């Protein structure tokens, strides 16, 4: 069921897993949670989501909460502005330590609690 796209194949997830489990998932798959470095990423990601909400490999780093990606992708601030959704990360209840796709939209990103379940993505590259 892996989708194919830009080098990498996207598992969509039918069972909703804690973040932390999701990602072990992905592990044992020789994945990880899905990195998102381009609109065009963006777009395929929640286009195939068609509007529920997955887990993607967004979650905190460091004593001073920056966001972070678990493949190790080096997460880029500005160029990421455009992804979340207007308000996010807004740190609800500040307890929203892990990120998703939330919203069928270009700015799609939320912050939400890591033990909360959800669908989620792996990420897995084609190595020819
Ligand atoms: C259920 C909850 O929804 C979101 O937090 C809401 C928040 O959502 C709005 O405002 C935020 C910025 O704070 C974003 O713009 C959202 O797009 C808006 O919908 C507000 O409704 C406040 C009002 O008190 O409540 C928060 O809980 C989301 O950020 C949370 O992660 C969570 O999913
Ligand atoms: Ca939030």
Request: glycine content about 8%.
């Amino acid at each position: 069921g892996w989708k194919y796209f830009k080098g990498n194949f996207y598992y969509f997830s039918l069972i909703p897993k804690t973040w932390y489990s999701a990602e072990q998932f992905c592990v044992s798959r020789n994945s990880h949670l899905t990195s998102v470095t381009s609109e065009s990423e963006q777009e395929f990601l929640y286009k195939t989501a068609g509007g529920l909400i997955y887990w993607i490999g967004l979650t905190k780093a460091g004593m001073e909460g920056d966001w972070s990606w678990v493949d190790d992708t080096p997460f880029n601030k500005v160029q990421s502005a455009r992804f979340w959704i207007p308000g996010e990360p807004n740190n609800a209840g500040n307890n929203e330590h892990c990120g998703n796709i939330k919203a069928p939209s270009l700015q799609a990103w939320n912050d939400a609690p890591c033990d909360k379940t959800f669908l989620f993505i792996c990420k897995r590259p084609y190595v020819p």
